[PDB]
Amino acid sequence: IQRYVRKDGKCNVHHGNVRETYRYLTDIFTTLVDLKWRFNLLIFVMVYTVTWLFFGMIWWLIAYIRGDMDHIEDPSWTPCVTNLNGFVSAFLFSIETETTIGYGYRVITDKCPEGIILLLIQSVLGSIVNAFMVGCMFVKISQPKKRAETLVFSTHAVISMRDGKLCLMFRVGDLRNSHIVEASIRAKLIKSKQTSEGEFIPLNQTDINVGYYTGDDRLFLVSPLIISHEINQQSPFWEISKAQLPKEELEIVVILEGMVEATGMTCQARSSYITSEILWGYRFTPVLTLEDGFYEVDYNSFHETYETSTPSLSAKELAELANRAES
Amino acid sequence: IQRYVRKDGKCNVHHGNVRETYRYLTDIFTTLVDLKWRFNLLIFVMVYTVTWLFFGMIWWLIAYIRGDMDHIEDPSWTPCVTNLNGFVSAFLFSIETETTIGYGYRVITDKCPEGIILLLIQSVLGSIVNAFMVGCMFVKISQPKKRAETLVFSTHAVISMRDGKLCLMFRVGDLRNSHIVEASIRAKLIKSKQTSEGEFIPLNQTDINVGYYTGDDRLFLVSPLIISHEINQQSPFWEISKAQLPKEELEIVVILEGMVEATGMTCQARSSYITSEILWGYRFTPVLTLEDGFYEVDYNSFHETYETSTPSLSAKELAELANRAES
Amino acid sequence: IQRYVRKDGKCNVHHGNVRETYRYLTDIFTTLVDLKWRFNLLIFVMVYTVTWLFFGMIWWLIAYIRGDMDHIEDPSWTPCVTNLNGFVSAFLFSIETETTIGYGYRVITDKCPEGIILLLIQSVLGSIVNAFMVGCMFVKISQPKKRAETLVFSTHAVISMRDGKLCLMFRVGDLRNSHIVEASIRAKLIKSKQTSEGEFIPLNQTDINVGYYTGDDRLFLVSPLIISHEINQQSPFWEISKAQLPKEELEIVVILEGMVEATGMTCQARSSYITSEILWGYRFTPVLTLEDGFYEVDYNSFHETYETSTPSLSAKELAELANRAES
Amino acid sequence: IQRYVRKDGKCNVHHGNVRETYRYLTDIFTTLVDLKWRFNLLIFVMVYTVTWLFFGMIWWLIAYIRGDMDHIEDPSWTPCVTNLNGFVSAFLFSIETETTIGYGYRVITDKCPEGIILLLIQSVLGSIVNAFMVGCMFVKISQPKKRAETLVFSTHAVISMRDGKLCLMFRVGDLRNSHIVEASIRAKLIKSKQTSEGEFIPLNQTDINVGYYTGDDRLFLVSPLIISHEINQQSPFWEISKAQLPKEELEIVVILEGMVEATGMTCQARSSYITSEILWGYRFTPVLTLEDGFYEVDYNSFHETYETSTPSLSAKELAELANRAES
Ligand SMILES: [K+]
Ligand SMILES: [K+]
Ligand SMILES: [K+]
Structure with missing residues (x-):
């Protein structure tokens, strides 16, 4: 005063009664970097976990279309991802792959052609989910x-x-x-x-x-x-x-x-x-x-x-x- | 009007009858970032898949020069990449390597000297294929x-x-x-x-x-x-x-x-x-x-x-x- | 003329008889990006291979101080890197680690304390060897x-x-x-x-x-x-x-x-x-x-x-x- | 003079008796890049090792809450990270994961739900520890x-x-x-x-x-x-x-x-x-x-x-x- x-x-x-609030989401990057760090660190945390279990749902669903769960003990049914049995394992397979950790206790096999596509669209999209966030962490540090x-x-x-x-x-x-x-x-x-x-x-x-x-x-x-x-x-x-x-x-x-x-x-x-x-x-x-x-x-x-x-x-x-x- | x-x-x-259209491809980076997102997301998708199956063809061809396919059941013939048997597996080996996932169900062996060179030129060139594209995704976000x-x-x-x-x-x-x-x-x-x-x-x-x-x-x-x-x-x-x-x-x-x-x-x-x-x-x-x-x-x-x-x-x-x- | x-x-x-040629190497980054692409692509190729076999020599030498080569068939001698036997394998272990591929056919063990240090100084220095070169590839593209x-x-x-x-x-x-x-x-x-x-x-x-x-x-x-x-x-x-x-x-x-x-x-x-x-x-x-x-x-x-x-x-x-x- | x-x-x-020394730590990034290289290379080395053994302590402590160490020879007790037995192995598991090397000799299992959270908070925070440092190495090179x-x-x-x-x-x-x-x-x-x-x-x-x-x-x-x-x-x-x-x-x-x-x-x-x-x-x-x-x-x-x-x-x-x- x-x-x-x-x-x-x-x-x-104080910037009063701004009505066109879509303008903030029209440039989602710059309205993200000017956030507080707690809100930056939370949305960074929120986006990777919602990415991995999203793909982990798709790594789950390809077992149901293929029926790898229907013949899990039956060893002739080579799964799309071997040793993938449950959703706790299916979600764990995405973090090992989207982060490119890749332990290989669960390793994708070649008998299934469907999840080969899923290796692409997890990795070709997980790189920009990285880049939309690893670059956002940089320019908030280097501002x-x-x-x-x-x-x-x-x-x-x-x-x-x-x-x-x-x-x-x-x-x-x-x-x-x-x-x-x-x-x-x-x-x-x-x-x-x-x-x-x-x-x-x-x-x-x-x-x-x-x-x-x-x-x-x-x-x-x-x-x-x-x-x-x-x-x-x-x-x-x-x-x-x-x-x-x-x-x-x-x-x-x-x-x-x-x-x-x-x-x-x-x-x-x-x-x-x-x-x-x-x-x-x-x-x-x-x-x-x-x-x-x-x-x-x-x-x-x-x-x-x-x-x-x-x-x-x-x-x-x-x-x-x-x-x-x-x- | x-x-x-x-x-x-x-x-x-409207920028009419531009004749020297090589000038757009003379600076391929800036004419890429000003594209629509769908066209940016498609060319990003197109370049990684054409990279992996390119090297997957070379990971295939080293099996034919070495004759690992000619002695696939014969276990004394240690392949250049063990458990690489088909092109669906050979293409899968590139994604595990160019993205640096590296499961190790297919793991490159040391008996072959040819694919050791192929680990370099896949990784030393796959990093700039990453960098030409992970940087392109960043500056379109941070524009x-x-x-x-x-x-x-x-x-x-x-x-x-x-x-x-x-x-x-x-x-x-x-x-x-x-x-x-x-x-x-x-x-x-x-x-x-x-x-x-x-x-x-x-x-x-x-x-x-x-x-x-x-x-x-x-x-x-x-x-x-x-x-x-x-x-x-x-x-x-x-x-x-x-x-x-x-x-x-x-x-x-x-x-x-x-x-x-x-x-x-x-x-x-x-x-x-x-x-x-x-x-x-x-x-x-x-x-x-x-x-x-x-x-x-x-x-x-x-x-x-x-x-x-x-x-x-x-x-x-x-x-x-x-x-x-x-x- | x-x-x-x-x-x-x-x-x-033409910039004639420049005598203080150390000034070009005093700022090695900007004199690198203004090179031709062939010279940029060659020095990018040259630095990663000279990095990996440098560490591959150190991954070799820790086998000689430990005598893992002296008891290679003797299975009680757990090596620092298991299944590391030759220099073709030792050099291959560096590319699997400095690029963070990490197949795990050769996997570092915990019985040796010396190479645990070598995992740090390969990875903590291989990241800046990446960053001095993956950033150099970017700003030559985005110039x-x-x-x-x-x-x-x-x-x-x-x-x-x-x-x-x-x-x-x-x-x-x-x-x-x-x-x-x-x-x-x-x-x-x-x-x-x-x-x-x-x-x-x-x-x-x-x-x-x-x-x-x-x-x-x-x-x-x-x-x-x-x-x-x-x-x-x-x-x-x-x-x-x-x-x-x-x-x-x-x-x-x-x-x-x-x-x-x-x-x-x-x-x-x-x-x-x-x-x-x-x-x-x-x-x-x-x-x-x-x-x-x-x-x-x-x-x-x-x-x-x-x-x-x-x-x-x-x-x-x-x-x-x-x-x-x-x- | x-x-x-x-x-x-x-x-x-010489910038004499500066009293508000918190102002240097109020912008920790720019006071980091203007350091000497030895001090930049030391703090880069210091932060990754203090990161890995920090998480390696947490990868240790989840074995004690679960009692995987209390039943280490007992094979029915599937650990949170299998083949994790000692702190030399627990610290080694973090470097394989935070750098996304991921050998898979030690591989995290799905029976434990606690360390699944620890895969997130190691990887979602290890990426910004990378980005706060891999970007710091870049702009000191590209200055x-x-x-x-x-x-x-x-x-x-x-x-x-x-x-x-x-x-x-x-x-x-x-x-x-x-x-x-x-x-x-x-x-x-x-x-x-x-x-x-x-x-x-x-x-x-x-x-x-x-x-x-x-x-x-x-x-x-x-x-x-x-x-x-x-x-x-x-x-x-x-x-x-x-x-x-x-x-x-x-x-x-x-x-x-x-x-x-x-x-x-x-x-x-x-x-x-x-x-x-x-x-x-x-x-x-x-x-x-x-x-x-x-x-x-x-x-x-x-x-x-x-x-x-x-x-x-x-x-x-x-x-x-x-x-x-x-x-
Ligand atoms: K592995
Ligand atoms: K890996
Ligand atoms: K990896």
Whole structure:
């Protein structure tokens, strides 16, 4: 309510009264991988057992059409699967075959032509039942959405006059010595707005130019670096003074997107900054020290902000007051 | 005819008299995965059976060169595969070996040196026959082109003066609590045009600036958000009044591209808006309500449009009439 | 010599005296997949056989340390692998185990503790020998570089005054009803140039603005569409008249990049246009006809160019002669 | 210390006092693949053996609940797994089953219902233990981060007046006849800076416009080509004369990003240039010669730089001195 997207990156959105629920089953794969693990591990368990006893019913039924059960002690009646006698054995024959274990205490014989077809359609279909599930287990393990746990954001965002221009800043860092190839940063300001025609938008997304023009959005992320957005005329913080910033009802949403290095999958690290986390007159503490040929990044001071001197007027007043300085 | 691309996303295009049909077989993998499932499941079935009886013919023929069939009852003649007697058994030996089931009622012996080579070339080639097909079954299951079923578009597009500027708008929403990383929106206007030199183009694609300059095309898609294109001078709707919009022969094509979250594959969600679906003087109904800490998105009102007051002149007249207001 | 990159897309470049040949073996995977298939199929064959007889030597040597061969007829000496007697049988035991066939005519026994370790290190290492090779066979099959065989280019490029501005044009089409998601077009002019300081560059790449500014480079590729580059002042064809175009020594290189739809891999379709393939005063024939609700694309007329009336002056003269028209 | 990122591409950064070490285990897959191979091969070995003897304990314990050990010589007591007698045999039964070898000297029987469940939960869980590890071995083999070994950079960067404008240049080349699809080049200048407000940034990243505006950053990389950055007013080398360039404390970081051709993974090739590797008045030697229809690229002269005549003033003086030439 207070917050749109959590500081973890989770979003406070319930997707209400979706009516076309066939659309979830229209792409059964992607709605399967985004399940919980317990539900993934249960449906993985459920599909193999329902596969084996399905074929185990067919390995049972070919004994009844052939009458191998009707002459079980009669040894001249060579069965389709020898030593298959009961359903506990018939179901056991499928697991030995669909998993390609194949013990051969029960071994299919050649006198029966019917189950030879059943060796095909168990094995040619059991491979895709494997592949629909062994691939589903892989891409839930190798998903990029968990790489964001090692991409940390600053807990607060700060505002200070960086080189004459008032700038909004927040720190982002990577906790690994592996890289984020094609690392891009972008930022959306979301706030309720009301147009001149009465059309009130509840959570309107508005861009924040964190360097999309000059090429500064694509960033190099070995060390924690401060993402500075210059509060200029096009910025949505252009008329925000230090009087309004406790009273505003806005929310920054930052999205650090970039490909995982060891794969080609693209991670997305979301974080947010609400108007009680925006700090006026503060700046970040440095983290890089030089020691024995290497720059050491103390991550304990990653969030540490200290108060510096800063004017309290908005950037709209600060430019015009600078315009009176030349007179 | 009336429509270029369907509201589902399918395109009303037949690809006519393609002559270089070897180009389809020049990349046999990608022309295989885009088949129907019945044709994928049939060619998967067809290739394993034609593999096993191919090797089963070679497991047959090594009995004839060795004369194991010529001394089948003679027990001193240890065969290359013992208990291999007929082609129904020889074909059965391949399925037990190429699938690596290996029952061992028929078990290859060491007295024969010829079939030892045949164990290699069945297993070293049966693995890639597996891999050319078990991978083909995977990427047809894990394809991003089915993720677009959960990316819904508004059924209509609307036009209304959003904050003094006339703007064309359409809603897009995501039906899941999973995200679309790197979600981009772009829009093409396609219409027949005739140049000054008589060169008439049948379906000429023309861009619609939905925010490609400012960075507004890359969008954050947890909640349904309105994609607004400002009707400015560079826009192709610049001289379109409400008199012409029933009479036009144009068609919007919107493309929402973005990577699937759980994989790295990029989905493409197409939709279209023809000149009977463009609404003048209408605007969307809001969908986000706040309830118990979470924003709940009622998707029943996702398409709901209501009529608001709007001038009926074009944006070319609306700017110049505004230019007469300052006089 | 005449041509830099072929009309297929192959490049006429030999990579000379590369000295650091360890860099090829420093990434052994990617230098393996780009081999020919015969060399891929040979190294796949070579690695499994050298794996099995490697372990078959170890399955041999454990018989000598245990002396199972020294008491082969003596039945109280239960071997580590029973019925393992010779190297033809010992090598055969590895294929039955590393492929997980496991017939069980030769079956490992529990009296020996040494080969129990050998079951691990054969199976725990034979799985990655599989995975280093079954994955290598997959990504050579699923590579995007073969998707360019169904992306056709026009054989010629044309130049004609499209709507008052002289424009260079070439057609590109997709031969399938599957799409190219995120389809982008870009074009490089390569020609020898000599700077003012005598530094002569042999094949200097120079951009061609095919719509990179306005968003026209990202194209929608269901139907064959003409890629127009407007010959403006920044264009490298700005002072090229029809007198110079037979005499020039330039070469267009067009690159159509876009992701394959059924996967996430990005294809790259290269083609070229040399100064004998650039046509002045020509324009393309249309290909789209409307028939029974669908637009049918006759691909026979994909390359068909016809001569239209066009001024023969350059775009530098055509603007200035237009500048004299207003006088 | 002297250097931020090595000429190989490695970065001289230690990631200090990371406290939230659960974040590494929160995404156990990606922190596994970035390990060393010895640690990957050990954890792969450790997980299969701890899996098999885990189930081998359960295959042991079902003999004690059933009392198969209590009637081992008594043949009427058909065990759950026949010929399972000791823990050396019970552990051996798991490897024959979890790997799906299945010799059948020990073969599970149907009289026991308990171990039938144990066939499921060994096989339905041993497949994902395979898949969590056979996929981990694949993506460590198929990673794009090793493709950068065949992407070479020039060892030095040079500065010379290319066509009236002073330009900073460095060569990049690809050692293979395979391509880098979507090859982009970007460059960051990193140097310590001190703002007007005393906020001293230790290693501030600053862009270098290598052609991000005109579309020149996306480059075509069949032949070694010189990446030229024009020293203009927005460039950070704008006031750098030849007097300051030995005395500066800056460092170029170049990043050549592009997708691997045979896969869809994106490589990232980093290199660096420190102020002792920047050459004033030097230019590269050409490498392309034409021979027998093909351009041959002598890679021995890839790094070769020769001294040319160049003014020693900065680009700020060179423009203004040119401004005095028109007077
Ligand atoms: K067996
Ligand atoms: K087996
Ligand atoms: K097996």
